[PDB]
């Protein structure tokens, strides 16, 4: 509790590849962990401009910033200063697949995020490789303990510029690097938006708001 201050900064590094296009992203961010709110600024340092929709990347840049009821153990906050690790698979309806592995630690007072990501089997004419997405709709992640870790499931929806939508099934596993109290099953409501971006999305600012509730 005393190690996660009410205002926290973080740095993030991502190495990735989508349908063969390789890239690196460096970012800084900040937020109020106990309010469940955060913002980040991200810069494509290698491989820019990206030939794919930024949206598939935005959910990969921070579950330390989730507002939790007092009766729900904040497992991921408790994992610090050691931190936690998480791995994710997003299976999109058109066959596209994104895999992510991530490490979160605490160093010199800030959170350090190391991310690796791979996207594959995205149709060439699909909305991802053609940049036809308008960001994510608000999501509810079903969290539950299992295998000694905290798992999360979500059915997520990307807005399509034609007024339609692009569906994805997301499963994530978060595990503290030290023994900490796991919660019971609950839900986390998440809103993620791109708040600013330059013309070619080589600099992008994001906002996320996350809140835990009972079910």
């Amino acid at each position, epitope marked *: 509790m005393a190690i996660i201050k009410e205002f926290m900064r973080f740095k993030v590094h991502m190495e990735g590849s989508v349908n063969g296009h390789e890239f690196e992203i460096e970012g800084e961010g900040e937020g109020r962990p106990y309010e469940g709110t955060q913002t980040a600024k991200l810069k494509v340092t290698k491989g820019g401009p990206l030939p794919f929709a930024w949206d598939i990347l935005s959910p990969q840049f921070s579950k330390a910033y989730v507002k939790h009821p007092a009766d729900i153990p904040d497992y991921l906050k408790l994992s610090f200063p050691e931190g936690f690790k998480w*791995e994710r698979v997003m299976n999109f309806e058109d066959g596209g697949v994104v895999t992510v*592995t991530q490490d979160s630690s605490l160093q010199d007072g800030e959170f350090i995020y190391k991310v690796k990501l791979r996207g594959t089997n995205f149709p060439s004419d699909g909305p991802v490789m053609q940049k036809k997405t308008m960001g994510w709709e608000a999501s509810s992640e079903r969290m539950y303990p299992e295998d000694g870790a905290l798992k999360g499931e979500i059915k997520q929806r990307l807005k399509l510029k034609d007024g339609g939508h692009y569906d994805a099934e997301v499963k994530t596993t978060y595990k503290a690097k030290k023994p900490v109290q796991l919660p019971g099953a609950y839900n986390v409501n998440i809103k993620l938006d791109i708040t600013s971006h330059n013309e070619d999305y080589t600099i992008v600012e994001q906002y996320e708001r996350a809140e835990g509730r009972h079910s």
Partner: nanobody
Framework: VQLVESGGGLVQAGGSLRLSCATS????????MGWFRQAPGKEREFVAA????????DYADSVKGRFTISRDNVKNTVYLQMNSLKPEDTAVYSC???????????????????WGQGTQVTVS
């Protein structure tokens, strides 16, 4: 430190097997695991690998679509479901734990350690 493969056997092509590997001596759920196979006279080759969470899997091209790697992080066991078996799948199959606790699509034999004794798979 201790990996024991089981489930091998002899079947005709088109059949199925399910290899398992029981683990002991380390926090299984923190390590990626890999299946390799070694044919007579040849060197070990990569078959499949699975990250610590089980969400990220990787397969050699020659088995993709036919084989499925999985894991049970409660029982601490690795599995390789083998369907549509072909004669060229005949080999000794061995399981290994990744040396580094940060696997990411690493297929090299040198990226894995603590090898079990293996189990024989023969396909006619």
């Amino acid at each position: 430190v201790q990996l024991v493969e089981s489930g091998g056997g002899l079947v005709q092509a088109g059949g199925s097997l399910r290899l398992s590997c029981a683990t002991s001596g380390f926090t299984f759920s923190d390590y990626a695991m890999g299946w390799f196979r070694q044919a007579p006279g040849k060197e070990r080759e990569f078959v499949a690998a699975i990250s610590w969470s089980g969400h990220v899997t990787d397969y050699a091209d020659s088995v993709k679509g036919r084989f499925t790697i999985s894991r049970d992080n409660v029982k601490n066991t690795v599995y390789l479901q083998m369907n549509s078996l072909k004669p060229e799948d005949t080999a000794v199959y061995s399981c290994a734990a990744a040396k580094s606790g940060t696997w990411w699509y690493q297929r090299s034999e040198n990226d894995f350690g603590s090898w079990g004794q293996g189990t024989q798979v023969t396909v006619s």
